[PDB]
């Protein structure tokens, strides 16, 4: 207990104290400076923070795996996941040592508390479902809860209308690859545009027109680089260069026959995966067909979802497969590099959101905000239950944990009450970044719920207790259940360590 | 001095911060500020770069007050939005197309380095460059249509903007038979002239000693037949792309073109072909099959200027007029150091008028906007009665740091200038600013001290964005 | 890297350019005389022309 | 040796002490905190005093000598409220850094401070009150009102009523009926570690570490049959059997001559005890040791004596008993006998060393406060806190003017200098306002340790002092709510703030004139 677990408690708390300033909407972002490559990254989420920081404590590395679970499932506000488990390790320093209770009994106290916590989350859930009129309008305020935890919150009201219309164009699409997020340097966050179509960072050819209406777009996986690659282990056996000069030149006409098969489709736009030689590029100009190249893998995949087309390798049949059509493909130059703006898609299969910012660190970090926000919108459509956040959910569970402690009684109540006290420290840490009084705000919130008012909550903007429904603080049941159930089981494994085995370094 | 030994002498803030070695994690992000100033503004970098470290003195004074950084950052956000509206009230009405105004407004950015003595000839070249390439609808006006030619030798007084296609690289010069080209077609060759050499394995079975020289005769005939169709099209000027890649060229191509009096040039970048195709309008030729007379362009005369041993090709006249012409200017200087000084000097003048096309507003700078904004800010800050009253007032006190530095850097007393500024700008009208030549305050319109509103708006925006990123970092952690 | 500010830069630059200038001042006028340079590579050229000498001489401070 | 010119040694030299003086800034006022300083010898001294820390602290830059040189004169001049004054001593050099950036010449910065210093003192003379206009009873009531704010500063301020009567009754014994006099030289406080801090009493005299030798008698005899002050006496010459101290030789030519040397000391043993017994002096202090054969006869004749007493304590005993220490055995007489009311040895701990205590219940020249405490570290800290109280009363004696404390003085003179700066105009308008701006940092620093808004309190002071000219409104250090200092009995000596601010201003004039720093080894 003493030498067995020493750095497993204080060491894990010291890690959570570094990210303590990152918790909450009023928190601040931490700078990650790598000792190699002389690069840097500014991120609030602990997924990148805990991954790049050296961890001497093996228990701290376990907190990275549980962070990756909330990173994919939720991704926003994941700091409180490891912080909640750190408070359970602080209470375990007493009950196990001072009170002299076996660690498994303390774990069993948290096991019965985890079952009682799930009952408090389901009964307190609010059902928003059925008619999508008031539902979609509520998604504006529901998203603003987890939308911006950063210092970028000035873009909340601006991105609230863009994120709402993003799922509206998807029309029930749960795939996160159907949305396109564009990161552009310069400008302001309020300059973000949302149109129906796709905007590519590439350009057209030299003589390609700048505006084409009713263009038919078709992609493919072929390789136009030069000649024909054929099979492996080939060679040319000729008597002289008279036949050799014809073989190289004829294949340029053979590729033109494949381009002649492209002209049978009647497409006004062509897109190739790999690079294109100048001769087949000029043949596209004679036919009046745009050309796009230099797409490694996802280049042709992201455009296939927007246009709703299909990759055609053979070019044999102008009947089957798919033909995509866009109203206006005109090239529109945004910022410095010219961009290819598509509009008037055949269907709503996909959508594209354009973001603009002055700092490059804002583009990469805010990308995770809209990426996680759309996941929340997909969960509110699937899971019909929602809860209320803003420090209120922790005090509601504390009422159920303290109620179960009266039924169990015994010496396990010390571990059950410690779980409730650990839930009391989370809003204290949540309100610690705002710099307001903890004893004043927690006592007003904790006592109000015992009086039968579940609509109250912590307001860090005005520094008082306000209604979470009026301020628009709403969390879905899928987000709340995933955080509580994982954080309760995260510290369950950390409390099972009775020994430390350090292997010899390589 | 870089790691490779490159010596660069300039006062440009973006150039200094580019090669500057910074061991401080947060200070490394200050290079991004100078990168955004070149993309957005791109003009008057020496005057704009001071905004990177100007707010550092104001942010340090607020740390002792115990105010949360978000409150300080959000106060600068509203103060920046109010500062933009102040600049829009004092702007001057300026027409889109004019002559003396474009020379007077750009002359502020034209004079920084000692090279401003020759800026008298640079103003007609900078105005006519935008006068030729522009749109009355206020488009983006990409600067890529104006190419800066770097040639060693001569003086800036010899710098002249060419009205037609210019070629920096010369020919092989081995044969050098033709001394001039006039009334001839100028083609664009995207391929290369070499004996066939496919990328795959090539095995030529030779069963007779006569077949060896026969292969040589086939290589001579196959490569000449391409020149026969070029001679049939009456094209004496050929442009080949970079020749060091794969095929390159043989030694027999010189005698074929010299007999036909056809000039050829190689080692041309692929990006240069796109630039030359816009102004010349000649359709590039990617193979002899697509080669024809309709794709070829034409020109009245092509003269090769030889000065101080450096030869340069100049094309006069354009046959087919397209909707996307291009212009270029040949920079003449003693050494690459002066050429680099003129390089950044011409980048400023192009960005001044470019911001005037997008936003026709113009405001007098040189100390005027710093005092006017600070006067309308601290006055309204006292009416806030809260945390915003003790921030915006301190932020307004940071706006006078720029004219304080301009006074000390000019040798004049700082307070003596500020006293003249604070007294005159109290009531205030316009045009009142610091004059370095007269050593005092006078009208900046006659002293050629100005600045676009879009530049001043983007300057205070990136300055407000800089303090946001600095305050955004609450802790310094060394990761792996 | 190594960065120094103030008069220390301008002082070291003038003293460096003046030291290499006083070497070629002995060739001024009709009474001037040629000098020899040791390249340590085995090559040497004796001349009073400053175009070749300044090109051969290794420049210590980049201001030279 | 390093080469420093320009702003290198004209700024970082001032910035050096700026960061050093900001360390003790957290100790300002009764809300301050203590510090730990390890001596080079390995000992640890824990105190919050600005003068005590900077005295034993070894620093690098030579500006530390300028801060210590000022504290040497402050102890002999004022030395009152050192924790409060030491912070404002360096506040004048912080504002000068802003005037250098503005382009003002450094000497013009220094000369501008002395111009506004004489005008700020004249404004403080408006609101000062005269305590000497009342009687002796109201004067002691003014001391009780002052001893609350002034005397109590450092720790042990928990209970201030135990040391309240200590400082008040100390200056009552030695004082003039017209209230003009001071003696702090005969007042020495010697404390010990034991009991509780609330056990401190008032015992006038000295505390000797040496007890009565030959533990064959009583530790203390409270009464005396001869009365008349127990007849205290001290022998200056060492007590030994008489022998020539100079080099000499003895010649014994017979056994009778050797036998006379035996009765030699035997005759002197009775001669020395009878001369003391004839005078009837009970207390006889021997400076260096005593004779072993005489260790009995002293008890046989009832003559308590001590050995190895320092000469410094002997000077306080003769002046307290109104006697004269006996220079020579032949000069011993009853006219040099002293007066001692009561003498006893304190039990202190279980065994340890019994401390001999000389006490005079009536009026005496040597005033001492009996001090005992549990903590050993608080001894030197609590003594020096009450040692400054001797100069506190001295400031109220020599200067009859008293001003309301609580930082209200610097706020009062702030509005005057701001108005006087507009009369000179020129470049001195910002220089004179800068001198008052540096004094405005004192109120903002007081509220820093207490957790109160620095400007929100300062803005109320100038707003309240604009309607009413009374200076009773000042910064609240201890969180008493309303800022009126008249109900809280907060007063500070006029000459205290006068000299400490003036001498600091006179010193900073020569400090800002430093350009190059040349350091040579000793």
From Swiss-Prot, chain A:
Record InterPro entries: Chap_CCT_beta, Chaperone_TCP-1, Chaperonin_TCP-1_CS, Cpn60/GroEL/TCP-1, GroEL-like_apical_dom_sf, GROEL-like_equatorial_sf, TCP-1-like_intermed_sf
Keywords: Acetylation, ATP-binding, Chaperone, Cytoplasm, Nucleotide-binding
Record localization: Cytoplasm
UniProt GO molecular function: ATP binding; ATP hydrolysis activity; ATP-dependent protein folding chaperone; unfolded protein binding
GO biological process terms held by the UniProt record: chaperone mediated protein folding independent of cofactor; protein folding
Keyword Acetylation applies: yes
Pfam families: Cpn60_TCP1
Main location (coarse class): cytoplasm
GO cellular component, one term: chaperonin-containing T-complex
Role summary: Molecular chaperone; assists the folding of proteins upon ATP hydrolysis. Known to play a role, in vitro, in the folding of actin and tubulin. In yeast may play a role in mitotic spindle formation.
Record note on quaternary structure: Heterooligomeric complex of about 850 to 900 kDa that forms two stacked rings, 12 to 16 nm in diameter. Interacts with PLP2; this interaction leads to inhibition of CCT complex mediated actin folding.
Family affiliation: Belongs to the TCP-1 chaperonin family.
Name listed for the protein in its UniProt record: T-complex protein 1 subunit beta
Organism of provenance: Saccharomyces cerevisiae (strain ATCC 204508 / S288c)
Name of the gene encoding the protein in the UniProt record: CCT2
Curated annotation (Swiss-Prot), chain B:
GO CC list: chaperonin-containing T-complex
Major subcellular location class: cytoplasm
Subcellular location: Cytoplasm
Domain of life: Eukaryota
Gene Ontology biological-process annotations: chaperone mediated protein folding independent of cofactor; protein folding
Described purpose of this protein according to its UniProt entry: Molecular chaperone; assists the folding of proteins upon ATP hydrolysis. Known to play a role, in vitro, in the folding of actin and tubulin. In yeast may play a role in mitotic spindle formation.
Other comments on record: Present with 5530 molecules/cell in log phase SD medium.
Family matches, as NCBIfam families: chap_CCT_delta (TIGR02342), thermosome_alpha (NF041082), thermosome_beta (NF041083)
This protein's name: T-complex protein 1 subunit delta
From Swiss-Prot, chain C:
Cellular location(s): Cytoplasm
Effect of residue 32 to E: Temperature-sensitive
Domain of life per record: Eukaryota
Family from the record: Belongs to the TCP-1 chaperonin family.
Function text: Molecular chaperone; assists the folding of proteins upon ATP hydrolysis. Known to play a role, in vitro, in the folding of actin and tubulin. In yeast may play a role in mitotic spindle formation.
Subunit structure: Heterooligomeric complex of about 850 to 900 kDa that forms two stacked rings, 12 to 16 nm in diameter.
Listed name of the protein: T-complex protein 1 subunit alpha
Gene name in the database record: TCP1
From Swiss-Prot, chain D:
UniProt xrefs under CDD domains: TCP1_epsilon
PROSITE patterns named among the record's database cross-references: TCP1_1 (PS00750), TCP1_3 (PS00995)
Record InterPro entries: Chap_CCT_epsi, Chaperone_TCP-1, Chaperonin_TCP-1_CS, Cpn60/GroEL/TCP-1, GroEL-like_apical_dom_sf, GROEL-like_equatorial_sf, TCP-1-like_intermed_sf, TCP-1_chaperonin
Annotated GO CC locations: chaperonin-containing T-complex
Gene Ontology biological-process annotations: chaperone mediated protein folding independent of cofactor; protein folding
GO MF annotation list: ATP binding; ATP hydrolysis activity; ATP-dependent protein folding chaperone; unfolded protein binding
Domain of life: Eukaryota
Primary location class: cytoplasm
Pfam families: Cpn60_TCP1 (PF00118)
Subcellular location per the Swiss-Prot or TrEMBL entry: Cytoplasm
Keywords: ATP-binding, Chaperone, Cytoplasm, Nucleotide-binding
Transmembrane region(s): none
Entry keyword Ribonucleoprotein: no
Protein family membership: Belongs to the TCP-1 chaperonin family.
UniProt subunit comment: Heterooligomeric complex of about 850 to 900 kDa that forms two stacked rings, 12 to 16 nm in diameter.
Function: Molecular chaperone; assists the folding of proteins upon ATP hydrolysis. Known to play a role, in vitro, in the folding of actin and tubulin. In yeast may play a role in mitotic spindle formation.
Entry protein name: T-complex protein 1 subunit epsilon
Gene name of this polypeptide: CCT5
